[PDB]
Write an enzyme that holds these catalytic residues in place. Structure first.
Site, PDB file in Angstrom:
ATOM      1  N   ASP A  59       0.785  -1.217   0.000  1.00  0.00           N
ATOM      2  CA  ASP A  59       0.000   0.000   0.000  1.00  0.00           C
ATOM      3  C   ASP A  59       0.828   1.283   0.000  1.00  0.00           C
ATOM      4  O   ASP A  59       1.286   1.733   1.059  1.00  0.00           O
ATOM      5  CB  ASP A  59      -0.903  -0.060   1.243  1.00  0.00           C
ATOM      6  N   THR A  60       1.008   1.891  -1.186  1.00  0.00           N
ATOM      7  CA  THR A  60       1.774   3.136  -1.274  1.00  0.00           C
ATOM      8  C   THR A  60       1.077   4.288  -0.572  1.00  0.00           C
ATOM      9  O   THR A  60       1.720   5.311  -0.325  1.00  0.00           O
ATOM     10  CB  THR A  60       2.057   3.484  -2.731  1.00  0.00           C
ATOM     11  N   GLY A  61      -0.218   4.144  -0.281  1.00  0.00           N
ATOM     12  CA  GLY A  61      -0.969   5.177   0.436  1.00  0.00           C
ATOM     13  C   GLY A  61      -0.910   5.045   1.948  1.00  0.00           C
ATOM     14  O   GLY A  61      -1.591   5.804   2.649  1.00  0.00           O
TER      15      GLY A  61
HETATM   16  C1  CKV Z   1      -5.740  -0.671   2.725  1.00  0.00           C
HETATM   17  C2  CKV Z   1      -6.259   0.733   2.913  1.00  0.00           C
HETATM   18  C3  CKV Z   1      -6.193   1.044   4.386  1.00  0.00           C
HETATM   19  N1  CKV Z   1      -6.385   2.493   4.674  1.00  0.00           N
HETATM   20  S1  CKV Z   1      -8.072   2.847   4.856  1.00  0.00           S
HETATM   21  O1  CKV Z   1      -8.058   4.231   5.309  1.00  0.00           O
HETATM   22  O2  CKV Z   1      -8.625   1.795   5.696  1.00  0.00           O
HETATM   23  C4  CKV Z   1      -9.050   2.814   3.360  1.00  0.00           C
HETATM   24  C5  CKV Z   1      -9.835   1.706   3.103  1.00  0.00           C
HETATM   25  C6  CKV Z   1     -10.599   1.688   1.950  1.00  0.00           C
HETATM   26  C7  CKV Z   1     -10.578   2.767   1.083  1.00  0.00           C
HETATM   27  C8  CKV Z   1      -9.794   3.870   1.357  1.00  0.00           C
HETATM   28  C9  CKV Z   1      -9.028   3.900   2.508  1.00  0.00           C
HETATM   29  C10 CKV Z   1      -5.608   3.485   3.890  1.00  0.00           C
HETATM   30  C11 CKV Z   1      -4.227   3.710   4.540  1.00  0.00           C
HETATM   31  C12 CKV Z   1      -4.282   4.053   6.042  1.00  0.00           C
HETATM   32  C13 CKV Z   1      -3.008   3.867   6.842  1.00  0.00           C
HETATM   33  C14 CKV Z   1      -2.538   2.590   7.107  1.00  0.00           C
HETATM   34  F1  CKV Z   1      -3.245   1.547   6.645  1.00  0.00           F
HETATM   35  C15 CKV Z   1      -1.382   2.368   7.824  1.00  0.00           C
HETATM   36  C16 CKV Z   1      -0.640   3.414   8.325  1.00  0.00           C
HETATM   37  C17 CKV Z   1      -1.097   4.703   8.090  1.00  0.00           C
HETATM   38  C18 CKV Z   1      -2.254   4.925   7.356  1.00  0.00           C
HETATM   39  N2  CKV Z   1      -2.652   6.285   7.153  1.00  0.00           N
HETATM   40  C19 CKV Z   1      -1.848   7.186   6.501  1.00  0.00           C
HETATM   41  O3  CKV Z   1      -0.786   6.891   5.982  1.00  0.00           O
HETATM   42  C20 CKV Z   1      -2.372   8.604   6.494  1.00  0.00           C
HETATM   43  C21 CKV Z   1      -2.827   9.016   5.093  1.00  0.00           C
HETATM   44  C22 CKV Z   1      -4.141   8.413   4.689  1.00  0.00           C
HETATM   45  C23 CKV Z   1      -4.212   7.716   3.496  1.00  0.00           C
HETATM   46  C24 CKV Z   1      -5.413   7.172   3.081  1.00  0.00           C
HETATM   47  C25 CKV Z   1      -6.539   7.359   3.858  1.00  0.00           C
HETATM   48  F2  CKV Z   1      -7.722   6.835   3.458  1.00  0.00           F
HETATM   49  C26 CKV Z   1      -6.491   8.063   5.039  1.00  0.00           C
HETATM   50  C27 CKV Z   1      -5.287   8.583   5.450  1.00  0.00           C
HETATM   51  C28 CKV Z   1      -2.870  10.515   4.854  1.00  0.00           C
HETATM   52  C29 CKV Z   1      -3.594  11.337   5.700  1.00  0.00           C
HETATM   53  C30 CKV Z   1      -3.659  12.704   5.492  1.00  0.00           C
HETATM   54  C31 CKV Z   1      -2.987  13.239   4.414  1.00  0.00           C
HETATM   55  F3  CKV Z   1      -3.049  14.572   4.218  1.00  0.00           F
HETATM   56  C32 CKV Z   1      -2.270  12.435   3.552  1.00  0.00           C
HETATM   57  C33 CKV Z   1      -2.212  11.066   3.768  1.00  0.00           C
HETATM   58  C34 CKV Z   1      -5.511   3.123   2.405  1.00  0.00           C
HETATM   59  N3  CKV Z   1      -5.316   1.652   2.229  1.00  0.00           N
END
Ligand code: CKV
Ligand code: CL
Ligand code: CL
Ligand code: CL
Lengths: 99, 99
Positions: free
Chosen positions: B25-27
């Site tokens: 997960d690059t995000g």
């Molecule tokens: C597998 C899914 C799991 N989560 S999710 O929210 O459940 C999700 C599930 C389904 C659909 C969309 C999202 C996401 C990552 C979350 C995550 C981790 F997993 C592990 C460690 C850290 C973090 N969070 C960040 O790094 C912060 C960051 C962020 C990115 C995506 C987001 F949505 C929310 C916040 C961020 C915040 C503010 C800003 F200005 C810039 C970037 C995306 N991949």
């Protein structure tokens, strides 16, 4: 281009005539953008994971320009904390993970 | 390898001698795995997701193999919906985004 992951992979996108910053997210199935107006029909959807779920509006056949690359697909609009470019649009620009 | 994004980028990881499936997960800034036993002391950490913030346990200097590549670094443990490999470890294995 080649994007390293030392920092968040944020890029400029153009959507609905607006310039926005968005995160290239290989771990998102769908593209989710903060509240904005988009043309056409929409249907409600719930998306979630960490911290729970949010309600979004699903718009289909939306054009986005990501780093000069045009792509068309479904865009979800809602109270996301960050604009996210998900796999549905990353595939269209030919984005791959490499190691 | 070169991984396309038509499907979720799921890979096998090895942690604590056990094979698990995880999403590249690059995000995600950090790596978060589902409940399991890890050695040593842990520190508190909050991570933000699409729906809000959650509390996780932060373990440092944990040995983890990702798609056969060895990494040693921070691993968070908490109620994540899927095991996630975030940028802290994607950088260690030399992962980049390319288009
Ligand atoms: C597998 C899914 C799991 N989560 S999710 O929210 O459940 C999700 C599930 C389904 C659909 C969309 C999202 C996401 C990552 C979350 C995550 C981790 F997993 C592990 C460690 C850290 C973090 N969070 C960040 O790094 C912060 C960051 C962020 C990115 C995506 C987001 F949505 C929310 C916040 C961020 C915040 C503010 C800003 F200005 C810039 C970037 C995306 N991949
Ligand atoms: Cl789509
Ligand atoms: Cl392809
Ligand atoms: Cl680390």
């Amino acid at each position: 281009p080649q994007i390293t992951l030392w920092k968040r992979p944020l890029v400029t996108i153009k959507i609905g005539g607006q310039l926005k910053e968005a995160l290239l997210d290989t771990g998102a199935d769908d593209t989710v953008i903060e509240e904005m107006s988009l043309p056409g029909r929409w249907k409600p959807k719930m998306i979630g994971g960490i911290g729970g779920f949010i309600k979004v509006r699903q718009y289909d056949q939306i054009i986005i320009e990501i780093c000069g690359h045009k792509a068309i697909g479904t865009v979800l609009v809602g109270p996301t904390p960050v604009n996210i470019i998900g796999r549905n649009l990353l595939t269209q620009i030919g984005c791959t993970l490499n190691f």
